[PDB]
């Protein structure tokens, strides 16, 4: 009964959408925001916080504020990704008795789906508050590269949240369904360039209209699972650490609190530089010793940021070339390019993509919302708010 909600369960941010007839709507959460940080905190007084309230208390509760769980879900403890993360994450990653990668909080061992379920519960409650009725059914997205274990673990997170998971849909296909509502009629071949907080994906997708059905077919996919916005942040963090050392002679990498503050400040400055030519990073009392307190104040220009991440943006191009080769297409066979993911808002990324294809990406696809909207469209196809759509093998 009710609506089948569409959920984008992201590395960095999650969001929820519904179909109101032919019109998708992305829903704002209890904090008023159309996206929710994928952050789950277990507080000293026993509450579970999700989203911005969790983000806001991370500095004072670092061992019990969980994030980036999408990097662990469905994985084995000795997976190379997991082993890297054990060393860098401030929370405790452990081996379950069966060999899976788990987390431990205040002595309680938890599987990754038990943590991502808290985000899904917030998406469910958001939709219930908006609609005035219970929500029990959902479509949840996953990256195209996810394996069976990762897909099943995501389905399990939905069940833990009290949702019947009607379908798992791949993120590029969801973006294509969002585009396909307001697209030109007939045959179209699109390139979906998705640069999120954790991973990069390029998919070539063909849309057709035949025998009264709109068909969608993935012609090729490629990507880099170690290329995401968090890597852009890391380059800026490293610059700030190096500049502070050069100027003040102190290495902040030894101080976890300082490094947590730098991570937040670096991400804020990076986002600011998508619309400004320069910005300033100010962190009072970033460290202190017997000589006195030290305050960081560093100007970062857009040119400097571009130089720090140029090679990351360039790493996204070779997969583009291979995906076209695999699809048997040249760049002149692509009708539209769709940017998906918050990190595509960087002007340098937009310019490099346009230069590669020789045409500007579509402006009427919101890179932050397309995946959630596509999940909602799939939910409409299952009910009947949306008719005549077929996903081809
Ligand atoms: N205006 C902006 N300019 C540059 N980067 C941005 C901007 N807005 C958001 N970002 C970055 O986008 C990333 C988040 O993108 P998004 O929400 O698409 O990821 P996600 O869907 O959670 O990740 P994934 O698809 O990898 O699971 C973060 O690294 C964030 O700092
Ligand atoms: K997202
Ligand atoms: Mg995403
Ligand atoms: Na992505």
SS (H, E, C) 163-222: CEEEEEEEHHHHHHHHHHHCCCCCCEEEEEEEECCCCEEEEEEEEEEECCEEEEEEEEEE
CA dist 147 → 15, 55, 323, 351 (Å): 22, 29, 20, 32
Point out the catalytic residue in the list 100, 118, 137, 194: 194
Q: Which of 194, 182, 167, 207 is nearest to 383 (CA)?
A: 167
Whether 171 sits among the annotated catalytic residues: the reply is yes
Angle at 356 between CA 355 and CA 361, to 5 degrees: 70
Tell me the C-alpha distance between 325 and 320, whole Å: 9
Give the 3-state secondary structure of residue 7: strand
CA dist 145 → 8, 15, 46, 150, 322 (Å): 15, 20, 36, 9, 16
Resolution of the PDB structure in angstroms: 1.4
Tell me the C-alpha distance between 125 and 102, whole Å: 26
Tell me the C-alpha distance between 253 and 251, whole Å: 6
Tell me the C-alpha distance between 354 and 360, whole Å: 5
Tell me the C-alpha distance between 357 and 274, whole Å: 21
- Alpha helix (H) residue ranges in 64-196: 80-88, 112-131, 148-160, 171-181
CA of 35 to the centre of ligand 4 (A): 15
Point out the catalytic residue in the list 55, 70, 214, 294: 70
CA dist 64 → 58, 92, 200 (Å): 8, 9, 28
Number of H helices and E strands in the chain, helices first, is: 11, 19
Q: Could you tell me if 258 and 241 are in contact, meaning their C-beta atoms sit under 8 angstroms apart? A: no
Measure the N-to-C terminal CA separation of the chain; round to a whole number of Å. 29
Tell me the C-alpha distance between 1 and 79, whole Å: 40
Strand 4-9 and strand 137-142: pairing?
parallel
Q: Could you tell me if 327 and 204 are in contact, meaning their C-beta atoms sit under 8 angstroms apart? A: yes
Name which residue sits closest to atom 29 of ligand 1, judged by CA: 229
Whether 368 sits among the annotated catalytic residues: the reply is no
Identify the H or E element spanning 231: helix 229-248
Tell me how far the alpha carbon of residue 126 is from its chain's centroid.
Answer: 19
Q: Which of 391, 393, 383, 378 is nearest to 178 (CA)?
A: 378
Q: CB-hemisphere CA count at 13 Å for 109?
A: 8
Tokens 């907080």: give the residue.
197
Tell me how far the alpha carbon of residue 50 is from its chain's centroid.
Answer: 16
| Partners of residue 390 on adjacent β-strands | 215
| Partners of residue 164 on adjacent β-strands | 137
Q: CB-hemisphere CA count at 13 Å for 152?
A: 5
Q: Which long-range contacts (CB under 8 A, 24 or more apart) does 266-272 make?
A: 266/233, 266/236, 266/237, 266/240, 267/233, 269/236, 269/300, 269/305, 270/229, 270/232, 270/233, 270/236, 270/305, 270/346, 271/345
Is the CB of 346 inside a 6 Å radius of any atom of ligand 1?
yes
> Can you state the angle between helices 229-248 and 302-315, rounded to 10 degrees?
140
Q: Could you tell me if 24 and 18 are in contact, meaning their C-beta atoms sit under 8 angstroms apart? A: yes
The four Cα atoms 115, 119, 120, 122 give a dihedral, to 10 degrees, of 130
Is the CB of 341 inside a 6 Å radius of any atom of ligand 1?
yes
CA of 18 to the centre of ligand 2 (A): 15
Tell me how far the alpha carbon of residue 372 is from its chain's centroid.
Answer: 11
CA of 319 to the centre of ligand 1 (A): 20
Whether 70 sits among the annotated catalytic residues: the reply is yes
Identify the H or E element spanning 283: strand 278-289
Q: CB-hemisphere CA count at 13 Å for 132?
A: 0
Tell me the C-alpha distance between 157 and 149, whole Å: 12
Give the 3-state secondary structure of residue 245: helix
Q: Could you tell me if 92 and 115 are in contact, meaning their C-beta atoms sit under 8 angstroms apart? A: no
What method was applied to determine this entry? X-ray
Tell me the C-alpha distance between 64 and 58, whole Å: 8
Point out the catalytic residue in the list 3, 8, 100, 336: 8
Whether 8 sits among the annotated catalytic residues: the reply is yes
């Amino acid at each position: 009964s009710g609506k089948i909600i569409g959920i984008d369960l992201g590395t960095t941010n999650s969001c929820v959408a519904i179909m109101d007839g032919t019109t998708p709507r992305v829903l704002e959460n209890a904090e008023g925001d159309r996206t929710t940080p994928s952050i789950i905190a277990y507080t000293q007084d026993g509450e579970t916080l999700v989203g911005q309230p969790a983000k806001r208390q991370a500095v004072t509760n670092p061992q019990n504020t969980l994030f980036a769980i999408k990097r662990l879900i469905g994985r084995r403890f000795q997976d190379e990704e997991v082993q890297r993360d054990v060393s860098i994450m401030p929370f405790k990653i452990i081996a379950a008795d069966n060999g899976d990668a788990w987390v431990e909080v205040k002595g309680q061992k938890m599987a990754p789906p038990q943590i991502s379920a808290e985000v899904l519960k917030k998406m469910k409650k958001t939709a219930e508050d908006y609609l005035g009725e219970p929500v029990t059914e959902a479509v949840i997205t996953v990256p195209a590269y996810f394996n069976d274990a990762q897909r099943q673990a995501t389905k399990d997170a939905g069940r833990i949240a009290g949702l019947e998971v009607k379908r798992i849909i791949n993120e590029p296909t969801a973006a294509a369904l969002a585009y396909g509502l307001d697209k030109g009629t007939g045959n179209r071949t699109i390139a979906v360039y998705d640069l999120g907080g954790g991973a990069f994906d390029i998919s070539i997708i063909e849309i057709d209209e035949v025998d009264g059905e709109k068909t969608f077919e993935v012609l090729a996919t490629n990507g880099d699972t170690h290329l995401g916005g968090e890597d852009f942040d890391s380059r800026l963090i490293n610059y700030l650490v190096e500049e502070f050392k050069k100027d003040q002679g102190i290495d902040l990498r030894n101080d976890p609190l300082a490094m947590q503050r730098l991570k937040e400040a670096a991400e804020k400055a990076k986002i600011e530089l998508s619309s400004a030519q320069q910005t300033d990073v100010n962190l009072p009392y970033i460290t202190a010793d017997a000589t006195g307190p030290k305050h960081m104040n560093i100007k970062v220009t857009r040119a400097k940021l571009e130089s720090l991440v140029e090679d990351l943006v360039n790493r996204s191009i070779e997969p583009l070339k291979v995906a076209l080769q695999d699809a048997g297409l040249s760049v002149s066979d692509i009708d539209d390019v769709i940017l998906v993911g918050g990190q595509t808002r960087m002007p340098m990324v937009q310019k490099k993509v346009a230069e590669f294809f020789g045409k500007e990406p579509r402006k009427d696809v919101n890179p932050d919302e397309a995946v959630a909207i596509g999940a909602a469209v799939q939910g409409g196809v299952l009910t009947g708010d949306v008719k005549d759509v077929l996903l081809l093998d």
